[PDB]
Design a protein around this ligand. Structure first.
Ligand SMILES: CCCCCCCCCCCCCCCCCC(=O)OC[C@H](COP(=O)([O-])OCC(O)COP(=O)([O-])OC[C@@H](COC(=O)CCCCCCCCCCCCCCCCC)OC(=O)CCCCCCCCCCCCCCCCC)OC(=O)CCCCCCCCCCCCCCCCC
Ligand SMILES: CCCCCCCCCCCCCCCCCC(=O)OC[C@H](COP(=O)([O-])OCC[N+](C)(C)C)OC(=O)CCCCCCCCCCCCCCCCC
Ligand SMILES: CCCCCCCCCCCCCCCCCC(=O)OC[C@H](COP(=O)([O-])OCC[N+](C)(C)C)OC(=O)CCCCCCCCCCCCCCCCC
Ligand SMILES: CCCCCCCCCCCCCCCCCC(=O)OC[C@H](COP(=O)(O)OCCN)OC(=O)CCCCCCCCCCCCCCCCC
Ligand SMILES: CCCCCCCCCCCCCCCCCC(=O)OC[C@H](COP(=O)(O)OCCN)OC(=O)CCCCCCCCCCCCCCCCC
Ligand SMILES: CCCCCCCCCCCCCCCCCC(=O)OC[C@H](COP(=O)(O)OCCN)OC(=O)CCCCCCCCCCCCCCCCC
Ligand SMILES: CCCCCCCCCCCCCCCCCC(=O)OC[C@H](COP(=O)(O)OCCN)OC(=O)CCCCCCCCCCCCCCCCC
Ligand code: HEM
Ligand code: HEM
Lengths: 98, 31, 445, 379, 52, 56
């Protein structure tokens, strides 16, 4: 089933190994930077700590133990609610320029 | 904008309560 | 009731004229208040170098005393009825308007007749008024917008009476005696160049008979034969920079030669101007403002306040912008602002033209609200145009313009025309005149 | 008082360049190759000068002069073979740098990527012109073939090839022009590399993870200076192995023969680093199609920023894209192997398939894989 | 990009810049002909064909 | 004025300016080359090869 292949790919992706939440791995274009700026303080601080710890781990080429990996159902989508709004605003601006 | 004559000061003593006003296309005004 | 239907209603501007030549024009709608005033065709542009500032003196001394009304009795009568008497004098027109109730019309016209016909011009009051005008000059020195606009006129219309300031240099005000002022009154306050305009609860027949019974003594004869003639002016593309680094902000105004009063190209150009629009720091529109320059300024906090003007005299006028901003913002705006004009001269779109048309319609309708602005419109239009243009005609001319018309008129007036930059204050980054003139054309086009 | 390092304008530029430049702490060893390229460039220039001080540029006395460098100049063979093998090291580092840019999504830095493509073009041109200078059989015939390729250009082809030849074939004029351009070009490469670093510094380096490393930054000096020093030492070890033990490992023996225009080598091939494109042009039958595929094989790096469709910049978290990338690398090695081999069945079919698969991966398979990738992460 | 640039205002801008861009292309064509001394084109213009 | 007509017919647009410059150079090259060559041949009449090809 589709969710099975999604979970298998989540395991094979690798950013779960570095304790990295899904939205942390997104590329940072203008929409993404504006979305990150829009984040609340607690979420921003958690995001920056996760990114810094992952950068440390990749510099030392190690991953956290089996227990402290982000699971499939613990991988919340925190950036998505703001990113979708930013995308909608950009699309509205383009449609007005249309 | 200074004032050093009666004619310039004339009309500068407020006699009505202040009413702030700001728009979206018009600059802010007070009275 | 649609826009067009409401536009037609527009109570008319019934216009008449006495034997002397003083055109009487009124506009009755409903109100118990009415604004009545005369719009003489005096001003700085009719003043020579020696007597410049005579009009300002005459306006100052108008309300102080008359022959029939000894003095402060005039002010007592004006205040006792609740009338707010006021006056002003531009470079072209000078006007007095009693702004009072409808029932006080017979007395209001009488008061205006006394002021504009029998003025004491007392030497003692002249001497007391002399200090006040000098004080007013020190007042206006502080006002940066007024001085930058005076610099604009001085550097643009140099060598012509139009470049003269309305108040006058602070040397003529200390020498203008009764003789010069009396000549000004007897040579400019003439019946043909006067418009007795009233608006509100005013009856055209009532205004006509009041004018007949009061302003009959007005004459149109110009002394022996001395008839001051209108002198064409020469827009001289130049620049002036009064650099005073202690000033907080740098007022910079740049304009080119626009059209005259009668030129139809005024209607398109204003639309183009409405496309650029105007901005102040305390707006709140911010980044989402439709005008490109407004959004750029608000996004980067470039300026504090920019606005576009359409100063328009009889045969010529100024057309451009005036922006107040900090020291390290003058150049960038002069890049963006000009970047707008060239774009408007080459890439005008239907959407922005429609926006400008709507802005112009709204401005024309909103400005004509209240009895006093209507009186202003009648008085100014009977002199500049010779008739009061109804709102329906304005709507028709606005509907005529489109993107092609805007592009053509902007290319005619803006593209590759020498400007008249005039700065003030901490103007260091202000681009050199060659840079500005280069920016007045686009190499892609 | 001001610190001279941060106040003297020259030392200020050096400081902002590679003293206090904020660099990510987790950049892998694959970034060191960047410095290696510059190091190689510097080394090349030095050796080039010491080669230009004993090398005439005349057809009559070109090849012999080179022998005089190897047989007579005190410590001359070392300089000559140092140049010859440093060219190969330069191209190894260049290819690894391009691969690193493809993998970790460093091509998202658009201006640096385009400047790098220009640097690549210039480097291949310089190396090709350099290979002609020894005037061996391979140099002469390779120059002849490559310039004859330009005759396929419509209208202005024959005139262009005659003009570049300075005549009607590869001869004294062509050799002298090639020497002059080989001399000047590396300085243009140096200027372009300075521009490359300039454009890079306005955005900072990209870490393997792709995520912005602004929170975790370290000064360049105490760490990456010594890291690049170690990388340079390892590259020096490899290059010196090549020079001292098998100097002509990556070199066709036919080059050690005077360029005789009346006798072709039984097999004509470029140097190894030029085979990947060469085989590509061998795949296309049409003569102009060969030139177009040749130029596209390198110019397709321009489309990388536009063809990117995955929500993630890097490729550490894209397994399917990783298999695709390694398929592309294996295909490149396949083309390199095929190019040296003579045109004959089955190498014709394998070369055509390799070129087709290369273009298919670059333009089609990678973006489609990225689009499939996004759906698997609910975006 | 494939649809953001496809708009009525964008089409109008294209029409506005068609004369400028087209005669810029004419500028480039004439400059190329002059620089390369293209006989195939210059053989037709009078008083210039006398050069050859 | 002729100059004013030339300006606001063929000088206002910088692209029209470039086209004018291109055509002007096209004609000026021929005119200048012809004039200079004619002058130079006139100064050295009978001393160039082109003036003595007929003899041989
Ligand atoms: C024993 C049999 C297995 C040997 C290892 C095979 C393998 O694929 O190892 C990958 C493994 C790295 O796998 P990874 O973590 O997925 O990639 C990390 C990056 O390569 C970056 O990792 P790094 O920063 O440690 O640098 C490693 C880099 C060092 O070399 C280079 O950067 C230059 C490579 C070309 C020369 O070499 C490679 O990445 C390629 C593999 C080299 C041979 C092994 O190699 C090593 O850990 C280095 C091993 C060195 C020899 C001992
Ligand atoms: C491409 C633009 C035209 C180039 C060209 O060949 O112009 C003709 C002129 C002269 O040619 P021509 O005008 O005598 O006739 C064309 C001749 N062939 C077909 C051989 C080119 O070309 C040159 O002078 C140089 C050609 C290469 C330019 C790059
Ligand atoms: C080392 C070189 C030699 C030594 C130095 C001397 C070099 C030669 C003399 C200087 C030449 C400068 C360039 C010529 C003048 C000029 O164009 O100034 C820019 C001037 C300066 O501004 P402008 O105001 O004079 O012109 C632009 C404004 N309109 C269009 C209204 C006239 O700008 C232009 O000319 C813009 C249009 C250029 C079009 C060029 C077309 C070329 C076509 C053939 C290719
Ligand atoms: C020993 C010299 C360096 C400076 C060049 C001038 C500045 C520049 O590059 O301008 C690019 C031009 C300006 O665009 P503009 O929108 O006016 O301003 C930027 C913000 N939008 O932006 C553009 O898009 C213009 C691109 C050039 C168009 C040329 C058209 C005519 C020639 C063909
Ligand atoms: C190339 C990159 C490295 C060099 C540039 C960056 C480093 C700083 C400049 C060179 C240096 O080491 O200068 C040392 C010293 C500086 O002066 P000092 O008073 O010691 O310190 C305060 C002012 N910087 O200046 C001196 O001249 C010290 C005395 C001479 C050396 C002993
Ligand atoms: C070489 C063999 C070793 C190798 O590259 O192994 C793969 C390894 C992957 O490293 P990493 O991205 O940390 O893996 C995350 C897994 N979830 O490491 C990599 O993927 C890094 C190597 C690929 C990118 C760097 C550039 C070299 C690419 C190969 C040659 C390029 C030149 C020819 C092709 C163009
Ligand atoms: C690029 C230049 C080479 C073009 C390719 C080619 O085949 O050019 C042929 C020819 C070279 O010169 P050619 O006519 O052979 O000389 C005869 C002896 N004097 O080409 C020419 O003679 C002229 C080729 C055009 C480029 C030079 C002339 C224009 C330069 C720019 C002018 C405007 C600035
Ligand atoms: C003349 C040869 C070249 C030199 C000397 C050179 C120099 C450098 C250096 C020193 C760096 C920083 C270290 C690094 O990240 O590797 C760098 C980064 C980079 N170069 Fe090059 N380069 C060259 C060729 C190329 C080529 C051919 C490309 C691809 C077209 C390219 C694209 C890049 C990119 C994308 C980066 C940024 C990588 C990152 O930030 O992770 N360069 N270059
Ligand atoms: C971009 C860096 C450079 C590269 C990649 C490069 C590449 C080459 C190559 C491949 C050869 C042929 C070697 C052989 O067949 O034996 C060569 C030869 C030569 N190069 Fe360079 N070169 C570079 C820089 C320079 C510079 C800067 C100079 C001048 C100072 C120079 C001067 C020479 C000379 C004189 C030869 C002929 C000697 C010989 O072939 O062994 N090179 N170069």
């Amino acid at each position: 089933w589709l969710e099975g292949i999604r979970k298998w790919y989540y395991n094979a992706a690798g950013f779960n190994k570095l304790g990295l939440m899904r939205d942390d791995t997104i590329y940072e274009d203008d929409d993404v930077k504006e979305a990150i700026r829009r984040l609340p303080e607690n979420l921003y601080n958690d995001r920056v700590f996760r990114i810094k710890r992952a950068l440390d781990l990749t510099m030392r080429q190690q991953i956290l133990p089996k227990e402290q990996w982000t699971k499939y159902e613990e991988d919340k989508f925190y950036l998505e609610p703001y990113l979708k709004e930013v995308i909608r605003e950009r699309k509205e601006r383009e449609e007005w320029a249309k | 904008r200074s004032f050093l004559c009666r004619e310039s000061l004339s009309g500068q003593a407020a006699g009505r309560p202040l009413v702030a006003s700001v728009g979206l296309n018009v600059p802010a005004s007070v009275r | 009731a649609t826009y067009a239907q409401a536009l037609q209603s527009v109570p008319e501007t019934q216009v008449s004229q006495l034997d002397n030549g003083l055109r009487v024009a009124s506009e009755q709608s409903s109100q118990p208040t009415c604004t009545v005033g005369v719009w003489i065709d005096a001003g700085s542009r009719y003043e020579n170098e020696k007597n410049n500032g005579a009009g300002y003196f005459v306006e100052h001394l108008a309300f102080k005393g008359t022959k029939n009304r000894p003095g402060s009795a005039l002010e007592k009568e004006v205040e006792s009825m609740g009338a707010h008497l006021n006056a002003y004098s531009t470079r072209e027109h000078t006007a007095y308007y009693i702004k009072a109730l409808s029932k006080d019309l017979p007395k209001a016209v009488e008061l205006l007749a006394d002021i504009v016909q029998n003025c004491s011009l007392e030497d003692s009051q002249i001497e007391k008024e002399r200090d006040v005008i000098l004080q007013e000059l020190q007042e206006n020195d502080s006002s940066m917008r007024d001085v930058v606009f005076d610099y604009l006129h001085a550097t643009a219309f140099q060598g012509t009476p139009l470049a003269q300031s309305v108040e006058g240099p602070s040397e003529n005000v200390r020498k203008l005696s009764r003789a010069d002022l009396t000549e000004y009154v007897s040579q400019h306050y003439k019946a043909p160049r006067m418009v007795l305009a009233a608006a509100g609860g005013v009856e055209h027949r009532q205004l006509l008979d009041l004018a007949q019974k009061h302003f009959s003594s007005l004459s149109g004869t110009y002394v022996e034969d001395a008839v001051p003639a209108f002198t064409p002016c020469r827009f001289t593309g130049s620049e002036i920079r009064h650099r005073d680094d202690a000033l907080p902000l740098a007022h910079v105004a740049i304009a080119v030669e626009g059209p005259g009063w009668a030129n139809p190209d005024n209607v398109p150009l204003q639309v183009a101007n409405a496309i650029i629009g105007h901005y102040d720091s305390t707006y709140g529109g911010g980044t989402h403002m439709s005008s490109t320059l407004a959004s750029v300024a608000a996004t980067r906090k470039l300026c504090q306040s920019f606005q576009t003007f359409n100063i328009c005299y009889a045969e010529t006028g100024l057309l451009g912008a005036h922006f107040v901003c900090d020291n390290m913002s003058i150049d960038d705006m002069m890049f963006f602002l000009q970047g707008q004009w060239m774009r408007l001269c080459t890439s005008a779109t239907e959407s922005e033209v429609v926006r400008g048309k709507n802005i112009l319609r709204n401005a024309l309708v909103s400005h004509l609200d209240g009895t006093t602005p209507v009186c202003e419109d009648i008085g100014r239009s009977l002199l500049t145009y010779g008739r009061r243009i109804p709102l329906a005609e304005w709507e028709s001319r606005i509907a005529e313009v489109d993107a092609s018309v805007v592009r053509e008129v902007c290319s005619k007036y803006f593209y590759d025309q020498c400007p008249a930059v005039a700065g003030l204050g901490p103007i260091e980054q202000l681009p050199d005149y060659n840079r500005i003139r280069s920016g007045m054309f686009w190499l892609r086009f | 008082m001001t610190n001279i390092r941060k106040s003297h304008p020259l030392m200020k530029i050096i400081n902002n360049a590679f003293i206090d430049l904020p660099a990510p702490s987790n950049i892998s060893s694959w970034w060191n190759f960047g410095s290696l390229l510059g190091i190689c460039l510097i080394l090349q220039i030095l050796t080039g000068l010491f080669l230009a001080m004993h090398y005439t540029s005349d057809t009559t006395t070109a090849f012999s002069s080179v022998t005089h460098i190897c047989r007579d100049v005190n410590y001359g063979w070392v300089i000559r073979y140092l140049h010859a093998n440093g060219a190969s090291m330069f191209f190894i580092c260049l290819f690894i740098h391009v691969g690193r840019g493809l993998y970790y999504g460093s091509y998202m830095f658009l201006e640096t990527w385009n400047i790098g493509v220009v640097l690549l073009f210039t480097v291949m041109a310089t190396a090709f012109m350099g290979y002609v200078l020894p005037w061996g059989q391979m140099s002469f015939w390779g120059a002849t073939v490559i310039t004859n390729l330009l005759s396929a250009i419509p209208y202005i082809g024959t005139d262009l090839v005659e003009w570049i030849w300075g005549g009607f074939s590869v001869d004294k004029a062509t050799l002298t022009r090639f020497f002059a351009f080989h001399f000047i070009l590396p300085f243009i490469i140096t200027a372009l590399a300075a521009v490359h670093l300039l454009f890079l510094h306005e955005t900072g380096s990209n870490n393997p993870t792709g995520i912005s490393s602004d929170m975790d930054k370290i000064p360049f000096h105490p760490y990456y200076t010594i890291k690049d020093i170690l990388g340079a030492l390892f590259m020096m070890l490899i290059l010196l192995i090549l020079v001292l033990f098998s100097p002509d490992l990556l070199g066709d023996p036919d080059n050690y023969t005077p360029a005789n225009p009346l006798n072709t080598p039984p097999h004509i091939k470029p140097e190894w680093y030029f085979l990947f494109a060469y085989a590509i042009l061998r795949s296309i039958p049409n003569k102009l199609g060969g030139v177009l595929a040749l130029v596209a094989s390198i110019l397709i790096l321009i489309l990388m920023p536009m063809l990117h469709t995955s929500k993630q910049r890097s490729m550490m978290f894209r397994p399917l894209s990783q298999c695709l990338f390694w398929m592309l690398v294996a295909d490149l090695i396949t083309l390199t192997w095929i190019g040296g081999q003579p045109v004959e069945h089955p190498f014709i079919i394998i070369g055509q398939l390799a070129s087709i698969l290369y273009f298919l991966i670059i333009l089609v398979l990678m973006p489609i894989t990225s689009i499939i990738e996004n759906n698997l992460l609910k975006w | 990009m494939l649809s953001r640039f496809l708009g009525p205002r964008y089409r109008e801008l294209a029409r506005n810049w068609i004369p400028t861009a087209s005669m810029w292309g004419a500028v480039g064509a004439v400059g190329l002909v002059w620089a390369t001394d293209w006989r195939l084109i210059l053989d037709w213009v009078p008083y210039i064909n006398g050069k050859f | 004025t002729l100059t004013a007509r030339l300006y606001s017919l063929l000088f206002r647009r910088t692209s029209t300016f470039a086209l004018t410059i291109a055509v002007g150079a096209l004609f000026f090259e021929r005119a200048f080359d012809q004039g200079a060559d004619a002058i130079y041949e006139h100064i050295n009449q009978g001393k160039l090869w082109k003036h003595i090809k007929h003899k041989y």
